[PDB]
Amino acid sequence: EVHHEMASIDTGLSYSSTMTPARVAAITTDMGIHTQDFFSVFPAEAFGN
Amino acid sequence: IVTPVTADVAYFQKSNSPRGRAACVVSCENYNQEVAEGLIYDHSRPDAAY
Amino acid sequence: MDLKVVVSLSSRLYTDEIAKMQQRIGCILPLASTHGTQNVQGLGLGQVYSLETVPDYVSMYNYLSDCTLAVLDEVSVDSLILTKIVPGQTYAIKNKYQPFFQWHGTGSLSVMPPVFGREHATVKLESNDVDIVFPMVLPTPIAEEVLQKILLFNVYSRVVMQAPGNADMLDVHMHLGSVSYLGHHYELALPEVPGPLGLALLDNLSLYFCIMVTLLPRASMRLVRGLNLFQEMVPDEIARIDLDDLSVADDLSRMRVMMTYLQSLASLFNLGPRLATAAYSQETLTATCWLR
Amino acid sequence: VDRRRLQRRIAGLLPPPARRLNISRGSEFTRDVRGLVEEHAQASSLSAAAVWRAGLLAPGEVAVWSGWRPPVFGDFLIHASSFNNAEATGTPLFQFKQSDPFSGVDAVFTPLSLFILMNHGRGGLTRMANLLYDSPATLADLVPDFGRLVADRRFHNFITPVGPLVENIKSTYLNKITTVVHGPVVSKAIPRSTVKVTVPQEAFVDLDAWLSQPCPADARLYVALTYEEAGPRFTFFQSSRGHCQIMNILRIYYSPSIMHRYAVVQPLHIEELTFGAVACLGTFSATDGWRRSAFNYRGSSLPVVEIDSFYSNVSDWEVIL
């Protein structure tokens, strides 16, 4: 194994770097209609019969 | 291709497949046929479009 | 320090013999002697697990706990360069065995002689008349489970061959063909017809278990009479004790052979050479084990 | 076959490490006593002459036989929730065997963390047990069915010790511990420091002191999961015996609790007959062993026994009855 160590420390007071979202590439989800069923999230619960 | 009278118009207004489901046959895992016919003919599951 | 054992071959192999050995380049097998050059007649589990003799797990287990073990390294046309294991350092073995039991990291690997059919763990060589039987390497919970279940399968096949109204084949197969560990469910290759009068693997062990637990209620009452009330509290029907009609010589012989069969069966229920894995990587099927 | 080729090769093969040296005076510090006392380390800075001088490229064992084997590691990926990162570097771990077939993330257990499994399925240990692991349900779900496993008394063949930790690199979600599963527990760090096995004091009994002739060289560390009537307890045992003697000593040790378990509940079922299990974790020197100290977290400090120069050797579970 090749082990290495580095020590970095902020020399300014406020935020000295910024990161903005520039361009959307793709909405990688589909904004669909799919609810998570509670028989899988709360599986041990059932009714009286 | 004979379909029933109560197919919704919004399916026929978008780029779809002419049958009932779409075919997500590229999307399933490679070199497999049972999961492909799951993603083609299995109507215990719904097509993920609608 | 070297570890190479170069067993050479008398008549060089055919192409399919190399092709069948080359797929088993990671399995382990016993050696005859730990000498720096051997010949193929001494190799792993052949001279006891042969066709003409009756095969027995007791002698195979004693041979496996007797001699050294060795993973093999390469298969050439005329040689089988292989490295013996020593308990000093650790080795890279692979789960390339025909009943495929998926291992797990930090698993205790038992090496028992093969009970899944001779034909599954063999390389029947036609060049030299030798049948290299590789031993079946499986993790110890699966090992003790399959041992209990094939002991029970042998006694349940013998009890249905002695009488039909006792055990059923829908009873002794769904219960005993199923080995479950860590969610992995396994199916077993069992002899539906073992054939009577012994003559098959794991027969005498079932017979050893039968005579041991037959003579054991005669021994428990002798011990609680020699040694008590808490030990007479737990059994009820065995408390009907008749220690005064049997001769002391015959009772002594029965007690001695009971102790001997109990000991041999107990030492066999420890699975002999037990490797201990560290980090089983099933991406490359390679476990890291040492002799423990 | 030529002799001059074999002679120079066996002259590399033959000469051993110096097993003795007759010292003339113990203050010269000559080349010979330097050659006896120099040991090759397992770490070097990355250069050419650095690895050529520390000798990382020698096969088998590092040199520029002696019973010094490198240990075999076990690297385990766990959540950050089951392992308090401020726990000590030397603590013995317990990996649970999960019923999920392709898991990839397992469940490890410090004996500090293993206390609340016993005590929330229903002194100084309980305070630090609830302090170091604040929510008992984040461990009561890693074991999926603790109540059924304690009900059928199959809880010791599901738990395998992996020895003590050596390095716990702190990540935010999925944490990577590395333990030494077999061998000499030394630190994997660039300032190489000695690592001691920090076992809690109340979970420990010294069995040599419980009896209170021959003085051996190395003693073994035993753990003992036992099924009481009040739930399980993970008691540690230190002894200098073999397994086959210390199981009889443990039968003597828990012979009151055997009659007590028979007196509190009749084992009408088959599985209620078994009682407890012991397994060794490894060996250490019996003379300078098990010095006591304390462990500092924020809200308390429980006593902690430290065992140094450990040789990890995990053994299998042996029923006591």
Swiss-Prot record, chain A:
It comes from the Viruses. It is found in: Virion; Host nucleus. Self-assembles to form an icosahedral capsid with a T=16 symmetry, about 200 nm in diameter, and consisting of 150 hexons and 12 pentons (total of 162 capsomers). Hexons form the edges and faces of the capsid and are each composed of six MCP molecules. In contrast, one penton is found at each of the 12 vertices. Eleven of the pentons are MCP pentamers, while the last vertex is occupied by the portal complex. Homomultimer. Makes the hexons and eleven out of twelve pentons. Interacts with triplex proteins 1/TRX1 and 2/TRX2; adjacent capsomers are linked together in groups of three by triplexes, heterotrimeric complexes composed of one molecule of TRX1 and two molecules of TRX2. Interacts with scaffold protein; this interaction allows efficient MCP transport to the host nucleus. Interacts with capsid vertex component 2/CVC2. Interacts with the small capsomere-interacting protein/SCP. Belongs to the herpesviridae major capsid protein family. This is Major capsid protein. It comes from Epstein-Barr virus (strain B95-8) (HHV-4). The chain holds residues 1087 to 1135 of 1381 of the full protein.
Curated annotation (Swiss-Prot), chain C:
It comes from the Viruses. Its main location: virion. GO terms for cellular component: host cell nucleus; viral capsid. Keywords: Capsid protein, Host nucleus, Virion. Disulfide bonds: none annotated. InterPro entries: Herpes_capsid_2. HAMAP family: HSV_TRX2. Interacts with TRX1 and major capisd protein/MCP. This is Triplex capsid protein 2. It comes from Epstein-Barr virus (strain B95-8). The gene is TRX2.
Curated annotation (Swiss-Prot), chain D:
Keywords: Capsid protein, Host nucleus, Virion. One of its GO terms (cellular component) is host cell nucleus. GO terms for biological process: viral capsid assembly. It comes from the Viruses. InterPro entries: Herpes_1. GO terms for molecular function: DNA binding. It holds the Pfam family Herpes_VP19C. It is found in: Virion; Host nucleus. Coiled coil: none annotated. Interacts with TRX2, MCP and capsid vertex component 2/CVC2. Structural component of the T=16 icosahedral capsid. The capsid is composed of pentamers and hexamers of major capsid protein/MCP, which are linked together by heterotrimers called triplexes. These triplexes are formed by a single molecule of triplex protein 1/TRX1 and two copies of triplex protein 2/TRX2. Additionally, TRX1 is required for efficient transport of TRX2 to the nucleus, which is the site of capsid assembly. HAMAP family: HSV_TRX1 (MF_04018). Belongs to the herpesviridae TRX1 protein family. This is Triplex capsid protein 1. It comes from Epstein-Barr virus (strain B95-8). The lineage of its organism: Viruses, Duplodnaviria, Heunggongvirae, Peploviricota, Herviviricetes.
